[PDB]
A paper describes a structure:
In the structure of the STRN3-SIKE1 CC2 complex, two SIKE1 CC2 molecules (chains A and B) formed a homodimer to bind one STRN3 peptide, resulting in a 2:1 heterotrimer. STRN3 folded as an alpha helix with a C-terminal turn. Many residues mediating homotetramerization of SIKE1 CC2 in the apo state were now found to contact the STRN3 peptide. In addition, the side chains of residues E96 in chain B and R109 in chain A of SIKE1 CC2 formed two salt bridges and three hydrogen bonds with R176 and E185 of STRN3. Structural comparison revealed significant conformational changes in SIKE1 CC2 upon STRN3 binding. Secondly, in the presence of STRN3, SIKE1 CC2 became an asymmetric homodimer (chains A and B) with C-terminal regions in both chains bending closer to each other (about 22°). The bended chain B occupied a position corresponding to chain A′ of SIKE1 CC2 in the apo state. Since the STRN3 bound to SIKE1 as if it were a helical chain of SIKE1, the bending of SIKE1 CC2 thus blocked the binding of another STRN3 peptide, explaining the 2:1 stoichiometry.
Our results supported a “two-arm” architecture of the STRIPAK complex, with the PP2Aa/c-bound STRNs acting as an organizing center to hold Hippo or other MST kinases with STRIP1 as one arm and SIKE1-SLMAP as the other. Moreover, we determined the crystal structures of the second coiled-coil domain of SIKE1 alone, and in complex with an STRN3 peptide, as well as the structure of the first coiled-coil domain of SIKE1 in complex with the first coiled-coil domain of SLMAP.
Author numbering:
A (entry chain A): 68 to 119
B (entry chain B): 73 to 119
C (entry chain C): 172 to 190
Amino acid sequence: STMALLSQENTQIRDLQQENRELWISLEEHQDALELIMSKYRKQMLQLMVAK
Amino acid sequence: LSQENTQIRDLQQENRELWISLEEHQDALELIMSKYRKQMLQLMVAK
Amino acid sequence: WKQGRQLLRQYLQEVGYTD
């Protein structure tokens, strides 16, 4: 192919790389959210065991 | 056939794997948020 | 690879889910 980035094979590759990147970013966002919620869960558990 | 076809097939397999992992992370986050909410309810009952 | 499942399971067990 001479079309460079816009060749049919290269756009298929590029689209898959872009979607895989979005999935990897969402995974990182989910792990960030999980460790933040777990931090709050543990704090609230101390307050719970303190009151009850 | 060619190596571009091999790279496409590898990327599609990785895509399927990533969607599966994201499903597991979304499910775990939903389960943990549910427990966190219910713990807040119990902290409301105790306080 | 997908060893991130063990971390998720640690979290889930910490908040009281079981196997």
